[PDB]
Amino acid sequence: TSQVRQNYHQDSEAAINRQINLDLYASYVYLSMSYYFDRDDVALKNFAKYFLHQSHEEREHAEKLMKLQNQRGGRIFLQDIQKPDCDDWESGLNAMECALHLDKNVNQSLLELHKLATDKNDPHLCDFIETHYLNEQVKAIKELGDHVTNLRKMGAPESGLAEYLFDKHTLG
Amino acid sequence: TSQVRQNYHQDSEAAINRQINLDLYASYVYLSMSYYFDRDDVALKNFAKYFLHQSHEEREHAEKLMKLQNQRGGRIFLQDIQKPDCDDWESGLNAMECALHLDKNVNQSLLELHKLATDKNDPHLCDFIETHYLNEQVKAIKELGDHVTNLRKMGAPESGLAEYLFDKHTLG
Amino acid sequence: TSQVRQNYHQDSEAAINRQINLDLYASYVYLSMSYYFDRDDVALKNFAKYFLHQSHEEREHAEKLMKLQNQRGGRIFLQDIQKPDCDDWESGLNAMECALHLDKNVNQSLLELHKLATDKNDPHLCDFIETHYLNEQVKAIKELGDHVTNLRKMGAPESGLAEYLFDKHTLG
Amino acid sequence: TSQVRQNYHQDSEAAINRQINLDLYASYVYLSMSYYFDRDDVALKNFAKYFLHQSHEEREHAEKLMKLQNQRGGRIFLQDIQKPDCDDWESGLNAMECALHLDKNVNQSLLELHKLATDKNDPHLCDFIETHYLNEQVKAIKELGDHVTNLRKMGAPESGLAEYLFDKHTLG
Amino acid sequence: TSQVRQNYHQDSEAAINRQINLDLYASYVYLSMSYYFDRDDVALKNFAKYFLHQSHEEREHAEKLMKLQNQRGGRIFLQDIQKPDCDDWESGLNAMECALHLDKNVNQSLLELHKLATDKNDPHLCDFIETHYLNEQVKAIKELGDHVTNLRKMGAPESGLAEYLFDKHTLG
Amino acid sequence: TSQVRQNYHQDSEAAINRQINLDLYASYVYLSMSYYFDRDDVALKNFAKYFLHQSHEEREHAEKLMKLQNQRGGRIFLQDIQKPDCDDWESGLNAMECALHLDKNVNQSLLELHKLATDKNDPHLCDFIETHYLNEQVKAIKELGDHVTNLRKMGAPESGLAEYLFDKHTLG
Ligand SMILES: [Zn+2]
Ligand SMILES: [Zn+2]
Ligand SMILES: [Zn+2]
Ligand SMILES: [Zn+2]
Ligand SMILES: [Zn+2]
Ligand SMILES: [Zn+2]
Ligand SMILES: [Zn+2]
Ligand SMILES: [Zn+2]
Ligand SMILES: [Zn+2]
Ligand SMILES: [Zn+2]
Ligand SMILES: [Zn+2]
Ligand SMILES: [Zn+2]
Ligand SMILES: [Zn+2]
Ligand SMILES: [Zn+2]
Ligand SMILES: [Zn+2]
Ligand SMILES: [Zn+2]
Ligand SMILES: [Zn+2]
Ligand SMILES: [Zn+2]
Ligand SMILES: [Zn+2]
Ligand SMILES: [Zn+2]
Ligand SMILES: [Zn+2]
Ligand SMILES: [Zn+2]
Ligand SMILES: [Zn+2]
Ligand SMILES: [Zn+2]
Ligand SMILES: [Zn+2]
Ligand SMILES: [Zn+2]
Ligand SMILES: [Zn+2]
């Protein structure tokens, strides 16, 4: 038992390790999405930049959870980072829809982690999740919903004009 | 009778109280419109910002009339602020049409107030209305008419592309 | 169901709408109080400025809750904003006592909203209330209590000297 | 009953008074440790500076809890501040071990206070503890653990060279 | 015997330890007084600030004596810091009267310490006391006397107006 | 076939995808190493910072190869990123030895990729590898060798003093 460990349940430690993997996975999905939009036959530079930004953020989230694990005297155990479900993301709209679905999955995991912390009477962990993650997640989900709505209203994915203009006027 | 009161008719005092309520109502309508455009399934940020600006302006108008009432030795009596007629404003174009109709209603009230002031030989009140309100109202009505025209010509409300581009290029 | 909605109970959505109305009501009460102190037969300019500041803050609170409602995929429903209970607020002391009572009522509502969020296992909503509102409310209530105490000790409301000096030395 | 008091349980009020005493005690322990390292036959200036910093911080914590007690309408009751268990702290390593043990005791108290606040449905108090204290405490405990580890690995307490170099390279 | 110790009598060493405790006690009394004036039913912010300043100064005095003890090769022995005689300090005037009495008690102790140093032919200790403490103490006592006089002349403690205005015009 | 593709062999495209995976793996190994040194029972902050820097660099390498793949009209196919061989890295020295071995493995892969490019008469790819990667790799390997030598000469891993001082004087 770590000399620093206090009020830190085994289950919480395990759940933090799983959340580290999921954040890294989410980083990987966004990395794949980013370079899809970098292909010469897709060529939406600001969609590419947008997803690369999300990729780096998810990596930073994982790093912050790795720091938390050590702060509380838990031990980090890393797992393979699974390749994303798609190699080809179809269109700007489809990628935004996929991002939205991903972010709600990550959100569900965070909410389950918060519930566990509550159940184990770990107010430090509850506070960590609420402060660093919950509102960020809500904001990301709202932003992706907004983007999906605008793309649909503009006539995406069938209108390549719509995705081009959105890339310029919203993501640029 | 207030020690400051001079040449200030009872009817004028009453009409000022009614105009305070109407300006507050107009503030409320614009507040409702603003956050409609903030919904994830509408997602026109500059339409939202535009109407929030109008909301605050209408609130400032009411405050300035409350100051006038006290300046002249009248007594402010506040009434309930009625909820707007709609919860869902339909489209950018429809909201601009509704705004236009509202502003002409407020204008009619201001013009009736000015007529009353004229009828009661209250040149201070005539000057107050002419200086603070009449030209502002004419400008707002012209601007909203301009916006309605551009949205219609662009193909709104059926073209979600039209409302998107207008949001970016005129309201942004 | 909104594409963004997640872990957001119907009851929470409804309670947020009620809190929006109450914050707007509180804005209205403070607006009425402010211009009472602007009357020529009251003439306490810093009491007027103090309450106008509270009015605007309460309006900002409502706007922030309207943003939250949209962030979570809820739908804003606005209700009439009731006129305050008084047109004449009596004295600086009486207005401060009324403000204190109002702020504790708003606080009770916020605490009930937080309890609901807890009961519905909505840590994002718990965090929103705790972070934006609870400590602000506690501080406001403490400040109003302080002001009431000083006014009473100075000899208010019977001493117009007391309210004059307080206006200058505390609120100025 | 204080005019400001709301949702503030008697037990919470009492627990805050006890935490004020414990923070003051912790301040006192660190003050004693600091000047031990200031002795001519110990003479580790940065160990002295390190503990004096912790002493002042603990004093500030107590002051902030005294402010909270008044904010909520509780009444501060102060108790004697007990002298620390030791007059002679032995070595840098032993003092760091003692600091670590102290900080975990203070942490346990804070966690029990948070549990009480939760049990009494006092979200303002839960938020106060989580925001001002829990993460600070976790960070302090991690830092002290780090310091203990480095001192042990370097060969402390038997190596006066180890404590000298640590004083220079980590605490300086 | 410390390698640095020279011309430093056992009795002087003991008296320094007692003065350290008394300065810490005085710090504690002023801390209690400060937060009394922070209560919502007292609410004199500058009385609160004034006493908090005295609290910190007394703490600094103790720290400087702890440094002296080590400088001369004496050994610090800390004792419990007794809670102050009152939890409720009554009024601004009564607190200033209590402060005055406290400062004269601390002064008497300092003068007895100086007499001891003289009796033990310790000119370094005589100089330390004269330079760091005696004139500071005389100035504090004169200031508190001045404050008591002004509060009494203004009509304190019965005039809450007097204490309010003094808080603003002298302590602010 | 991509409209941009020219002189880009299928085998080269495949080898680039494998190198992307290996760079990401190397990023992951360094990430694991970094937070090992962040544990409270290891507590070498500059070893932690050093490996985190290498992690980010390897990620940037992968991103640059993903850009190259698109530049040449190849198609990125991502694979799982395998967890590192160790969860516990033992000591600073052992981690530096592991880093050295890893970097020579990555170097061997880069050299095989360069040989393939040469065999397929792809001077653009030869130039890309030589310019972005080969000299960087040689420098990293030399640096890690230097670090291993200094740690061994200082008495690592048995001397915790050696690893502490190296952390301060070389990595700090
Ligand atoms: Zn983030
Ligand atoms: Zn990073
Ligand atoms: Zn797999
Ligand atoms: Zn929390
Ligand atoms: Zn929080
Ligand atoms: Zn205007
Ligand atoms: Zn205003
Ligand atoms: Zn109605
Ligand atoms: Zn005119
Ligand atoms: Zn354009
Ligand atoms: Zn606020
Ligand atoms: Zn606003
Ligand atoms: Zn009504
Ligand atoms: Zn919370
Ligand atoms: Zn702190
Ligand atoms: Zn302080
Ligand atoms: Zn004792
Ligand atoms: Zn909380
Ligand atoms: Zn001093
Ligand atoms: Zn100090
Ligand atoms: Zn006692
Ligand atoms: Zn002398
Ligand atoms: Zn590089
Ligand atoms: Zn990058
Ligand atoms: Zn595997
Ligand atoms: Zn070449
Ligand atoms: Zn070259």
PDB file of all heavy atoms in Angstrom, chain C residues 142 145-147 149-150 153-154 161-162 165-166 169-170, chain E residues 38-45 160-161 164-165 168-169:
ATOM      1  N   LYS C 142     -24.865  37.110   3.388  1.00  0.00           N
ATOM      2  CA  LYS C 142     -23.986  37.624   4.448  1.00  0.00           C
ATOM      3  C   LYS C 142     -23.870  39.159   4.310  1.00  0.00           C
ATOM      4  O   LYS C 142     -23.992  39.891   5.296  1.00  0.00           O
ATOM      5  CB  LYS C 142     -22.601  36.965   4.343  1.00  0.00           C
ATOM      6  CG  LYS C 142     -21.524  37.437   5.355  1.00  0.00           C
ATOM      7  CD  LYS C 142     -22.012  37.279   6.799  1.00  0.00           C
ATOM      8  CE  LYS C 142     -20.867  37.480   7.842  1.00  0.00           C
ATOM      9  NZ  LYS C 142     -20.232  38.872   7.748  1.00  0.00           N
ATOM     10  N   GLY C 145     -27.131  40.833   5.376  1.00  0.00           N
ATOM     11  CA  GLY C 145     -27.176  40.779   6.849  1.00  0.00           C
ATOM     12  C   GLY C 145     -26.278  41.830   7.495  1.00  0.00           C
ATOM     13  O   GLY C 145     -26.670  42.536   8.446  1.00  0.00           O
ATOM     14  N   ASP C 146     -25.059  41.937   6.992  1.00  0.00           N
ATOM     15  CA  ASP C 146     -24.120  42.966   7.478  1.00  0.00           C
ATOM     16  C   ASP C 146     -24.744  44.371   7.365  1.00  0.00           C
ATOM     17  O   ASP C 146     -24.670  45.175   8.310  1.00  0.00           O
ATOM     18  CB  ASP C 146     -22.813  42.941   6.696  1.00  0.00           C
ATOM     19  CG  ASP C 146     -21.938  41.701   6.991  1.00  0.00           C
ATOM     20  OD1 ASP C 146     -22.206  40.893   7.912  1.00  0.00           O
ATOM     21  OD2 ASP C 146     -20.961  41.517   6.243  1.00  0.00           O
ATOM     22  N   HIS C 147     -25.314  44.662   6.197  1.00  0.00           N
ATOM     23  CA  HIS C 147     -25.910  45.977   5.909  1.00  0.00           C
ATOM     24  C   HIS C 147     -27.098  46.272   6.842  1.00  0.00           C
ATOM     25  O   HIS C 147     -27.220  47.366   7.375  1.00  0.00           O
ATOM     26  CB  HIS C 147     -26.385  46.011   4.430  1.00  0.00           C
ATOM     27  CG  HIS C 147     -25.273  46.062   3.425  1.00  0.00           C
ATOM     28  ND1 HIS C 147     -23.947  46.213   3.777  1.00  0.00           N
ATOM     29  CD2 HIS C 147     -25.302  46.043   2.066  1.00  0.00           C
ATOM     30  CE1 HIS C 147     -23.203  46.250   2.681  1.00  0.00           C
ATOM     31  NE2 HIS C 147     -24.003  46.178   1.631  1.00  0.00           N
ATOM     32  N   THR C 149     -27.603  44.936   9.803  1.00  0.00           N
ATOM     33  CA  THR C 149     -27.030  45.175  11.143  1.00  0.00           C
ATOM     34  C   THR C 149     -26.503  46.606  11.308  1.00  0.00           C
ATOM     35  O   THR C 149     -26.787  47.265  12.310  1.00  0.00           O
ATOM     36  CB  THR C 149     -25.926  44.141  11.426  1.00  0.00           C
ATOM     37  OG1 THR C 149     -26.545  42.844  11.597  1.00  0.00           O
ATOM     38  CG2 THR C 149     -25.097  44.532  12.695  1.00  0.00           C
ATOM     39  N   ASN C 150     -25.681  47.061  10.363  1.00  0.00           N
ATOM     40  CA  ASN C 150     -25.156  48.428  10.441  1.00  0.00           C
ATOM     41  C   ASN C 150     -26.258  49.476  10.410  1.00  0.00           C
ATOM     42  O   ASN C 150     -26.266  50.389  11.228  1.00  0.00           O
ATOM     43  CB  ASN C 150     -24.120  48.670   9.363  1.00  0.00           C
ATOM     44  CG  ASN C 150     -22.769  48.107   9.763  1.00  0.00           C
ATOM     45  OD1 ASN C 150     -22.122  48.610  10.675  1.00  0.00           O
ATOM     46  ND2 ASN C 150     -22.364  47.065   9.113  1.00  0.00           N
ATOM     47  N   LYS C 153     -28.001  49.423  13.870  1.00  0.00           N
ATOM     48  CA  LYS C 153     -27.113  49.977  14.910  1.00  0.00           C
ATOM     49  C   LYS C 153     -26.954  51.484  14.807  1.00  0.00           C
ATOM     50  O   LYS C 153     -26.809  52.169  15.833  1.00  0.00           O
ATOM     51  CB  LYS C 153     -25.728  49.322  14.865  1.00  0.00           C
ATOM     52  CG  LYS C 153     -25.770  47.835  15.244  1.00  0.00           C
ATOM     53  CD  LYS C 153     -24.669  47.426  16.208  1.00  0.00           C
ATOM     54  CE  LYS C 153     -24.770  45.962  16.500  1.00  0.00           C
ATOM     55  NZ  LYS C 153     -24.226  45.660  17.864  1.00  0.00           N
ATOM     56  N   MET C 154     -26.971  51.998  13.574  1.00  0.00           N
ATOM     57  CA  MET C 154     -26.849  53.443  13.326  1.00  0.00           C
ATOM     58  C   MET C 154     -28.126  54.234  13.684  1.00  0.00           C
ATOM     59  O   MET C 154     -28.090  55.469  13.787  1.00  0.00           O
ATOM     60  CB  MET C 154     -26.475  53.694  11.865  1.00  0.00           C
ATOM     61  CG  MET C 154     -25.056  53.267  11.475  1.00  0.00           C
ATOM     62  SD  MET C 154     -24.904  53.244   9.655  1.00  0.00           S
ATOM     63  CE  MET C 154     -24.623  55.003   9.342  1.00  0.00           C
ATOM     64  N   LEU C 161     -30.603  60.672   8.961  1.00  0.00           N
ATOM     65  CA  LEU C 161     -29.117  60.780   9.046  1.00  0.00           C
ATOM     66  C   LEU C 161     -28.362  59.446   8.894  1.00  0.00           C
ATOM     67  O   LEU C 161     -27.397  59.364   8.122  1.00  0.00           O
ATOM     68  CB  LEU C 161     -28.681  61.486  10.323  1.00  0.00           C
ATOM     69  CG  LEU C 161     -27.183  61.787  10.491  1.00  0.00           C
ATOM     70  CD1 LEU C 161     -26.613  62.615   9.291  1.00  0.00           C
ATOM     71  CD2 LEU C 161     -26.995  62.607  11.741  1.00  0.00           C
ATOM     72  N   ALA C 162     -28.761  58.427   9.660  1.00  0.00           N
ATOM     73  CA  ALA C 162     -28.203  57.070   9.535  1.00  0.00           C
ATOM     74  C   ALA C 162     -28.258  56.558   8.090  1.00  0.00           C
ATOM     75  O   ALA C 162     -27.234  56.155   7.536  1.00  0.00           O
ATOM     76  CB  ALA C 162     -28.925  56.105  10.465  1.00  0.00           C
ATOM     77  N   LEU C 165     -25.832  58.601   5.845  1.00  0.00           N
ATOM     78  CA  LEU C 165     -24.412  58.324   6.068  1.00  0.00           C
ATOM     79  C   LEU C 165     -24.029  56.925   5.569  1.00  0.00           C
ATOM     80  O   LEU C 165     -22.929  56.700   5.063  1.00  0.00           O
ATOM     81  CB  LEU C 165     -24.065  58.511   7.551  1.00  0.00           C
ATOM     82  CG  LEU C 165     -24.005  59.977   8.024  1.00  0.00           C
ATOM     83  CD1 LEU C 165     -23.779  60.041   9.538  1.00  0.00           C
ATOM     84  CD2 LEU C 165     -22.954  60.871   7.244  1.00  0.00           C
ATOM     85  N   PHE C 166     -24.944  55.983   5.727  1.00  0.00           N
ATOM     86  CA  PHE C 166     -24.690  54.609   5.253  1.00  0.00           C
ATOM     87  C   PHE C 166     -24.573  54.597   3.727  1.00  0.00           C
ATOM     88  O   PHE C 166     -23.690  53.963   3.141  1.00  0.00           O
ATOM     89  CB  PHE C 166     -25.826  53.687   5.701  1.00  0.00           C
ATOM     90  CG  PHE C 166     -25.588  52.234   5.369  1.00  0.00           C
ATOM     91  CD1 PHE C 166     -24.769  51.437   6.166  1.00  0.00           C
ATOM     92  CD2 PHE C 166     -26.164  51.679   4.220  1.00  0.00           C
ATOM     93  CE1 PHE C 166     -24.533  50.079   5.830  1.00  0.00           C
ATOM     94  CE2 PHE C 166     -25.945  50.323   3.861  1.00  0.00           C
ATOM     95  CZ  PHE C 166     -25.127  49.531   4.664  1.00  0.00           C
ATOM     96  N   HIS C 169     -21.042  56.076   3.090  1.00  0.00           N
ATOM     97  CA  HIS C 169     -19.833  55.469   3.641  1.00  0.00           C
ATOM     98  C   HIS C 169     -19.708  53.993   3.394  1.00  0.00           C
ATOM     99  O   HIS C 169     -18.596  53.463   3.423  1.00  0.00           O
ATOM    100  CB  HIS C 169     -19.754  55.722   5.140  1.00  0.00           C
ATOM    101  CG  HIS C 169     -19.162  57.039   5.499  1.00  0.00           C
ATOM    102  ND1 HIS C 169     -17.850  57.361   5.210  1.00  0.00           N
ATOM    103  CD2 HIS C 169     -19.667  58.089   6.189  1.00  0.00           C
ATOM    104  CE1 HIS C 169     -17.588  58.565   5.678  1.00  0.00           C
ATOM    105  NE2 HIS C 169     -18.672  59.029   6.277  1.00  0.00           N
ATOM    106  N   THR C 170     -20.831  53.304   3.225  1.00  0.00           N
ATOM    107  CA  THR C 170     -20.806  51.862   2.890  1.00  0.00           C
ATOM    108  C   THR C 170     -21.145  51.629   1.427  1.00  0.00           C
ATOM    109  O   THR C 170     -20.438  50.893   0.734  1.00  0.00           O
ATOM    110  CB  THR C 170     -21.769  51.092   3.759  1.00  0.00           C
ATOM    111  OG1 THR C 170     -21.319  51.185   5.126  1.00  0.00           O
ATOM    112  CG2 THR C 170     -21.834  49.586   3.356  1.00  0.00           C
TER     113      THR C 170
ATOM    114  N   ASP E  38     -16.216  40.378  12.307  1.00  0.00           N
ATOM    115  CA  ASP E  38     -16.674  39.749  11.071  1.00  0.00           C
ATOM    116  C   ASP E  38     -18.072  39.075  11.171  1.00  0.00           C
ATOM    117  O   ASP E  38     -18.620  38.671  10.136  1.00  0.00           O
ATOM    118  CB  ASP E  38     -15.633  38.713  10.629  1.00  0.00           C
ATOM    119  CG  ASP E  38     -15.922  38.131   9.241  1.00  0.00           C
ATOM    120  OD1 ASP E  38     -15.932  38.888   8.227  1.00  0.00           O
ATOM    121  OD2 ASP E  38     -16.124  36.907   9.165  1.00  0.00           O
ATOM    122  N   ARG E  39     -18.633  38.945  12.388  1.00  0.00           N
ATOM    123  CA  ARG E  39     -19.988  38.340  12.541  1.00  0.00           C
ATOM    124  C   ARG E  39     -21.019  39.220  11.853  1.00  0.00           C
ATOM    125  O   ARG E  39     -20.870  40.452  11.864  1.00  0.00           O
ATOM    126  CB  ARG E  39     -20.360  38.206  14.020  1.00  0.00           C
ATOM    127  CG  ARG E  39     -19.591  37.120  14.725  1.00  0.00           C
ATOM    128  CD  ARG E  39     -19.795  37.272  16.242  1.00  0.00           C
ATOM    129  NE  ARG E  39     -21.217  37.311  16.635  1.00  0.00           N
ATOM    130  CZ  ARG E  39     -21.655  36.983  17.863  1.00  0.00           C
ATOM    131  NH1 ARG E  39     -20.800  36.565  18.803  1.00  0.00           N
ATOM    132  NH2 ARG E  39     -22.959  37.046  18.141  1.00  0.00           N
ATOM    133  N   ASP E  40     -22.074  38.614  11.301  1.00  0.00           N
ATOM    134  CA  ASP E  40     -23.118  39.407  10.588  1.00  0.00           C
ATOM    135  C   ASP E  40     -23.891  40.337  11.515  1.00  0.00           C
ATOM    136  O   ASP E  40     -24.557  41.268  11.028  1.00  0.00           O
ATOM    137  CB  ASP E  40     -24.130  38.506   9.879  1.00  0.00           C
ATOM    138  CG  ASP E  40     -25.082  37.810  10.875  1.00  0.00           C
ATOM    139  OD1 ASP E  40     -24.733  36.750  11.423  1.00  0.00           O
ATOM    140  OD2 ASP E  40     -26.157  38.374  11.152  1.00  0.00           O
ATOM    141  N   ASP E  41     -23.864  40.043  12.832  1.00  0.00           N
ATOM    142  CA  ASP E  41     -24.583  40.854  13.835  1.00  0.00           C
ATOM    143  C   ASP E  41     -23.656  41.836  14.576  1.00  0.00           C
ATOM    144  O   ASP E  41     -24.036  42.431  15.603  1.00  0.00           O
ATOM    145  CB  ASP E  41     -25.317  39.945  14.849  1.00  0.00           C
ATOM    146  CG  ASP E  41     -24.376  39.002  15.588  1.00  0.00           C
ATOM    147  OD1 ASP E  41     -23.164  38.967  15.319  1.00  0.00           O
ATOM    148  OD2 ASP E  41     -24.861  38.258  16.475  1.00  0.00           O
ATOM    149  N   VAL E  42     -22.452  42.012  14.020  1.00  0.00           N
ATOM    150  CA  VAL E  42     -21.481  42.999  14.522  1.00  0.00           C
ATOM    151  C   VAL E  42     -21.097  43.879  13.328  1.00  0.00           C
ATOM    152  O   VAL E  42     -21.392  45.069  13.349  1.00  0.00           O
ATOM    153  CB  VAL E  42     -20.271  42.313  15.145  1.00  0.00           C
ATOM    154  CG1 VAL E  42     -19.278  43.399  15.691  1.00  0.00           C
ATOM    155  CG2 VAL E  42     -20.731  41.348  16.258  1.00  0.00           C
ATOM    156  N   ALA E  43     -20.461  43.266  12.327  1.00  0.00           N
ATOM    157  CA  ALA E  43     -20.314  43.783  10.949  1.00  0.00           C
ATOM    158  C   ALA E  43     -19.546  45.122  10.904  1.00  0.00           C
ATOM    159  O   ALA E  43     -19.998  46.090  10.272  1.00  0.00           O
ATOM    160  CB  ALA E  43     -21.691  43.920  10.298  1.00  0.00           C
ATOM    161  N   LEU E  44     -18.418  45.170  11.612  1.00  0.00           N
ATOM    162  CA  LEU E  44     -17.450  46.286  11.515  1.00  0.00           C
ATOM    163  C   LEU E  44     -16.151  45.782  10.854  1.00  0.00           C
ATOM    164  O   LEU E  44     -15.228  45.353  11.550  1.00  0.00           O
ATOM    165  CB  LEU E  44     -17.201  46.875  12.904  1.00  0.00           C
ATOM    166  CG  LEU E  44     -18.478  47.509  13.529  1.00  0.00           C
ATOM    167  CD1 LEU E  44     -18.286  47.794  15.022  1.00  0.00           C
ATOM    168  CD2 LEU E  44     -18.855  48.817  12.762  1.00  0.00           C
ATOM    169  N   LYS E  45     -16.087  45.887   9.511  1.00  0.00           N
ATOM    170  CA  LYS E  45     -15.031  45.273   8.703  1.00  0.00           C
ATOM    171  C   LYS E  45     -13.651  45.820   9.020  1.00  0.00           C
ATOM    172  O   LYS E  45     -12.665  45.110   8.878  1.00  0.00           O
ATOM    173  CB  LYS E  45     -15.258  45.442   7.179  1.00  0.00           C
ATOM    174  CG  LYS E  45     -16.496  44.758   6.558  1.00  0.00           C
ATOM    175  CD  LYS E  45     -16.644  45.162   5.027  1.00  0.00           C
ATOM    176  CE  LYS E  45     -18.019  44.646   4.377  1.00  0.00           C
ATOM    177  NZ  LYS E  45     -18.909  45.657   3.581  1.00  0.00           N
ATOM    178  N   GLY E 160     -24.179  53.012  18.335  1.00  0.00           N
ATOM    179  CA  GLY E 160     -23.736  52.182  17.201  1.00  0.00           C
ATOM    180  C   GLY E 160     -23.305  53.064  16.035  1.00  0.00           C
ATOM    181  O   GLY E 160     -22.423  52.666  15.245  1.00  0.00           O
ATOM    182  N   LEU E 161     -23.944  54.237  15.907  1.00  0.00           N
ATOM    183  CA  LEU E 161     -23.412  55.290  14.993  1.00  0.00           C
ATOM    184  C   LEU E 161     -21.935  55.661  15.224  1.00  0.00           C
ATOM    185  O   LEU E 161     -21.154  55.726  14.264  1.00  0.00           O
ATOM    186  CB  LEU E 161     -24.278  56.543  15.021  1.00  0.00           C
ATOM    187  CG  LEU E 161     -23.930  57.669  14.034  1.00  0.00           C
ATOM    188  CD1 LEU E 161     -23.903  57.163  12.553  1.00  0.00           C
ATOM    189  CD2 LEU E 161     -24.986  58.737  14.132  1.00  0.00           C
ATOM    190  N   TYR E 164     -19.683  52.743  14.119  1.00  0.00           N
ATOM    191  CA  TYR E 164     -19.747  52.722  12.637  1.00  0.00           C
ATOM    192  C   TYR E 164     -18.839  53.815  12.041  1.00  0.00           C
ATOM    193  O   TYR E 164     -18.016  53.537  11.164  1.00  0.00           O
ATOM    194  CB  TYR E 164     -21.195  52.928  12.164  1.00  0.00           C
ATOM    195  CG  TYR E 164     -21.321  52.999  10.655  1.00  0.00           C
ATOM    196  CD1 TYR E 164     -21.501  51.835   9.889  1.00  0.00           C
ATOM    197  CD2 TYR E 164     -21.235  54.227   9.996  1.00  0.00           C
ATOM    198  CE1 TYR E 164     -21.595  51.912   8.461  1.00  0.00           C
ATOM    199  CE2 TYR E 164     -21.316  54.326   8.626  1.00  0.00           C
ATOM    200  CZ  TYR E 164     -21.513  53.180   7.854  1.00  0.00           C
ATOM    201  OH  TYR E 164     -21.615  53.341   6.478  1.00  0.00           O
ATOM    202  N   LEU E 165     -18.988  55.056  12.511  1.00  0.00           N
ATOM    203  CA  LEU E 165     -18.223  56.164  11.936  1.00  0.00           C
ATOM    204  C   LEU E 165     -16.726  56.028  12.239  1.00  0.00           C
ATOM    205  O   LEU E 165     -15.869  56.379  11.426  1.00  0.00           O
ATOM    206  CB  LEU E 165     -18.782  57.505  12.430  1.00  0.00           C
ATOM    207  CG  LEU E 165     -20.130  57.916  11.807  1.00  0.00           C
ATOM    208  CD1 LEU E 165     -20.653  59.198  12.464  1.00  0.00           C
ATOM    209  CD2 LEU E 165     -20.105  58.045  10.227  1.00  0.00           C
ATOM    210  N   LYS E 168     -15.149  53.612   9.889  1.00  0.00           N
ATOM    211  CA  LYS E 168     -14.949  54.233   8.577  1.00  0.00           C
ATOM    212  C   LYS E 168     -13.813  55.264   8.568  1.00  0.00           C
ATOM    213  O   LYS E 168     -12.967  55.242   7.662  1.00  0.00           O
ATOM    214  CB  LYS E 168     -16.272  54.895   8.091  1.00  0.00           C
ATOM    215  CG  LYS E 168     -17.432  53.937   7.905  1.00  0.00           C
ATOM    216  CD  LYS E 168     -17.100  52.928   6.780  1.00  0.00           C
ATOM    217  CE  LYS E 168     -18.179  51.869   6.600  1.00  0.00           C
ATOM    218  NZ  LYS E 168     -17.769  50.910   5.483  1.00  0.00           N
ATOM    219  N   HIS E 169     -13.789  56.152   9.564  1.00  0.00           N
ATOM    220  CA  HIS E 169     -12.972  57.360   9.487  1.00  0.00           C
ATOM    221  C   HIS E 169     -11.619  57.240  10.129  1.00  0.00           C
ATOM    222  O   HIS E 169     -10.710  57.994   9.778  1.00  0.00           O
ATOM    223  CB  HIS E 169     -13.707  58.536  10.115  1.00  0.00           C
ATOM    224  CG  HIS E 169     -14.658  59.214   9.193  1.00  0.00           C
ATOM    225  ND1 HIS E 169     -14.236  59.875   8.056  1.00  0.00           N
ATOM    226  CD2 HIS E 169     -15.996  59.407   9.269  1.00  0.00           C
ATOM    227  CE1 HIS E 169     -15.280  60.415   7.457  1.00  0.00           C
ATOM    228  NE2 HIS E 169     -16.359  60.147   8.173  1.00  0.00           N
TER     229      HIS E 169
END
